[PDB]
Amino acid sequence: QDMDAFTARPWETRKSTRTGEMC
Amino acid sequence: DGSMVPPEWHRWLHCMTYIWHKFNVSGQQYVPYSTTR
Amino acid sequence: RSMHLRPMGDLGQ
Amino acid sequence: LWPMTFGLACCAVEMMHMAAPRYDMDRFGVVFRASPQSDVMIVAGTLTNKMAPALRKVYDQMRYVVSMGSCANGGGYYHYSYSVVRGCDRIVPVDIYVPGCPPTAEALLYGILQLQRK
Amino acid sequence: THTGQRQKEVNENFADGGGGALGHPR
Amino acid sequence: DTWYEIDMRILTGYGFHPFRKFPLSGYVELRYDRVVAEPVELAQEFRKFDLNS
Amino acid sequence: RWENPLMGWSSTADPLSNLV
Amino acid sequence: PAAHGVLRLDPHIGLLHRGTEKLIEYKTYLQALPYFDRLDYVSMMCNEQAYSLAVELLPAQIRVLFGEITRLLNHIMAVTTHALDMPFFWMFEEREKMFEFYERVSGARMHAAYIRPGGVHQDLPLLISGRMEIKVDDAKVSPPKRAEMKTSMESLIHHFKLYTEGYQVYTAIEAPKGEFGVYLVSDGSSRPYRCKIKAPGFAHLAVIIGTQDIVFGEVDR
Amino acid sequence: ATINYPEKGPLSPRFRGEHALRRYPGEERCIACKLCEAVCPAQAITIEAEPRSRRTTRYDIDMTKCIYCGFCQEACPVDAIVEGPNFEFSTETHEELLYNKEKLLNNGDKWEAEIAANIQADYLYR
Amino acid sequence: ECGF
Ligand code: SF4
Ligand code: SF4
Ligand code: SF4
Ligand SMILES: [Zn+2]
After folding, report:
1. Residue of chain H minimizing CA distance to E25
2. What's the CATH code of the domain at D95?
3. Taking the C-alpha atoms of F36, D12, H73 and I10 in order, what is their torsion angle to the nearest 10 degrees?
4. How would DSSP label each residue in chain D?
5. Are H6 and H216 spatial neighbours (Cβ–Cβ below 8 Å)?
6. CA torsion angle for E6, E7, E13, E18 (degrees, to 10)?
7. How many other C-beta atoms are found inside a 10 Å radius of the C-beta of residue H68?
8. Is the minimum CB–CB distance between I11 and chain E shorter than 8 Å?
9. Residue with the nearest Cα to atom 2 of ligand 3?
10. One GO term of the cellular component aspect (chain I) (predicted)?
């Protein structure tokens, strides 16, 4: 891709952890 | 009220041209909740 | 935080 | 239901469209009104922290509140900003919530008629 | 709910792709 | 055409520099509950995205 | 970061949470 | 009612300030396009045309035709609201017809988010200072068509990255209210580093009040 | 002009109203790519997924942050999320405007006889 | 006074 499980995705994760918790 | 029109007739009336009604049941009413464990 | 009794708490509350 | 208009941003020009010939709120008895001799206040448009005291003051001198638009509802596009009140519920008690950004003049007409039913 | 989780709104129908460009990536 | 601003007073509330690279949501909310200011607490926090390839 | 009672969001109280 | 929205008489503006310019810095170039319809909410397409022109740092263009339709929409509002300070109804019927044109081309009567950097979102349906194909054939800037996105791997990759991350990246126009310009500072990332919005009404505001057609969504941004 | 509301004003197949989650001709179409959430210019979409296939456990849309711009419908690579034709879903409380996966799926199950003909009318311009 |  880098440019003519199913738990989280790379962009939203801080860093891993998302929202305080990482065919 | 306008929400009484079935979706099939909603297209025709607005000149746009598992299924699945129920009108606006606010004031069923939908109450939100977490859909996760 | 996260008719006159409505602006008192958050959503739900 | 003589409404006093708090026209803040774009929701305001979608509600002056409902008094336009096509929708004509006056035919329902809902008149483009004046000094808060008004029954329902339509918070249409982003409420800023700077303006929230004014909104509460005009609420106090007035009754029902209809919240038009995502901004007035829960902040909308500007919810995460330091200058905007995340919703007008935090300032005034709201009776009807008209979603959309902006909601269509027909949607606000629906909100007004549902307030009439209330 | 189908996930398993203040009426409690619960959908009842517990769950290229057909249609050509109306489906999913082939 | 960074008046012109830049205040970033011409744009901020009375007694409030936001456009400094200052948290997005700020430091204080406003509620009735007058109208009073309180430390900012978001029901949902802004989810910082790491988009740079 | 606690969980919102109504929708289960990730609430916060630190303004500088997303300051990078 | 003749406060033109929110005005404390200088003019103590700040009643419609929402930190738009700061929020644009936290959102990619596509996510920031809707922010430009909500500035002069009587000149939505003209507002989002200047942003598109600036971004195209980096076309459809239909953009000039809809900019002229938007000029008519804005001038109707300006003249009729000036008179009201209601012909307002007489010409707001025509404004409603134009809103129907907007909705037929984009899907929303006011905030279309239609004129995008690279051209316009979709084709016309088989359609009508300063008070009434259709997009660049570069799938690294403009998203590919949905049919190609579901049949071609490069198109799917580009559709994925242009909507999650975006594309890696003053300009003034004659908006119906004056010179609407944007000073855009990119950076080199997928999000703008800085976005200053020169609004025609800011300098003009520095009972008109009606003849300067002041919209507070742009004086405050 | 005056029309007799609630005869209703003209709209187009591209109208951007109430959102709905859709299904294949029973299985849901959302495979939880999170591209609608990533694009959502108002951060109105909170998604959580788990194996389970790859389907969402949480799929929420905050109609009070949403600017109703259709970007999610456009970002979705499977036609699962969409703006429905419904513009008459006004509520009496704020909480009813914070949708859920169940609310959105019920919206997609109620408005499907119309959000499937509108797409067929407009899918060739997309 | 129109708000204050
Ligand atoms: S809800 Fe949308 S249309 Fe209404 S004031 Fe906010 S940005 Fe403008
Ligand atoms: S609705 Fe579509 S874009 Fe959003 S997570 Fe599901 S499949 Fe992905
Ligand atoms: S229409 Fe736009 S603002 Fe609303 S949920 Fe979809 S992407 Fe987000
Ligand atoms: Zn398949």
Report:
1. H150
2. 3.40.50.12280
3. 140
4. --EEEEE-SGGGGGTTTTSSTTT-GGGGT---------SEEEEES--BTTTHHHHHHHHHT--EEEEEHHHHHH-GGGTT-TTB-S-STTTS--SEEE-SSSPPHHHHHHHHHHHHH-
5. yes
6. -70
7. 13
8. no
9. I69
10. mitochondrial inner membrane
CATH number reported for the structural domain that contains residue I30 in this entry: 3.30.70.3270
**Residue boundaries of the structural domains of chain H:** 20-57+59-60+62-85+87-119+168-169+171-186+188-207+209-219
- Name the nearest CA neighbour of D7 among I88, H96, H42, F14: H42
Domain extent, residue I114, equals 19-51+54-122
Quickly count: other Cβ atoms within 10 Å of residue D34's Cβ.
11
Judge whether I19 is annotated as a binding position.
Answer: yes
Helix, strand, or coil here: A10? Answer: helix
Of H13, H17, H189, the CB nearest to F52: H189
Q: Which of H96, H121, H122, H119 is nearest to H109 (CA)?
A: H96
| Main-chain dihedrals φ then ψ at residue H164, nearest 5 degrees | -85, -60
Q: Which of D50, D42, D76, D88 has the alpha carbon at shortest distance from H220? A: D50
Residues in chain A, overall count: 23
**Considering every ligand atom, which ligand is closest to the CA of I44?**
3
Q: Which residues contact D43 (CB under 8 A, 6 or more apart)?
A: D6, D8, D55, D65, D66, D67, D68, D72, D88, D92, D94
In the block, tokens 């969409």 appear at: I82
Per-domain residue ranges for chain F? 5-5+7-32+35-40
> Residue D72 and residue D65: Cα distance in Å, rounded?
11
I chain contacts of residue E24, beta-carbon cutoff 8 Å: 29, 31, 77-79
- Closest by CA position to D45, among listed D84, D3, D93, D2: D84
CB contact under 8 A, C2 and F32: no
Distant-in-sequence, close-in-space partners of A19: CB < 8 Å, separation ≥ 6:
F47, G1, G9, G10
Cβ–Cβ < 8 Å for H213, H74: yes
Total structural domains in chain D? 1
Among chain G residues, the shortest Cα distance to B36 is held by G8
Pairwise CB contact (< 8 Å): F29 & D86:
yes
Resolution of this entry, Å: 2.0
Can you tell me the distance from the alpha carbon of H13 to that of D50, in angstroms, rounded to the nearest whole number? 9
H20-57+59-60+62-85+87-119+168-169+171-186+188-207+209-219: CATH number: 1.10.645.10
How many other C-beta atoms lie within 10 A of the C-beta of residue E11?
22
Instruction: State the virtual CA torsion across H53, F24, I43, D85 in degrees, nearest 10.
Output: -110
C-alpha to C-alpha distance for I2 and D18, rounded to whole angstroms: 10
Torsions phi, psi for F52 (to 5 deg): -60, 125
Tell me which amino acid residue H11 is: P
Nearest of D42, B26, D65, C10 to residue I97 by alpha carbon: B26
Domain membership flag for residue I96: yes
Unique residue bearing structure tokens 């799917």 = H156
Tell me, yes or no, whether I13 lies in a domain: no
**Residue I104: how many other CB atoms lie within 10 Å:** 26
**DSSP state for residue C4 in the 8-state scheme:** T
F43 exposed, middle or buried (CB, 10 Å; 0-12, 13-18, 19+)?
buried
Residue of C nearest to F33 (CA): C8
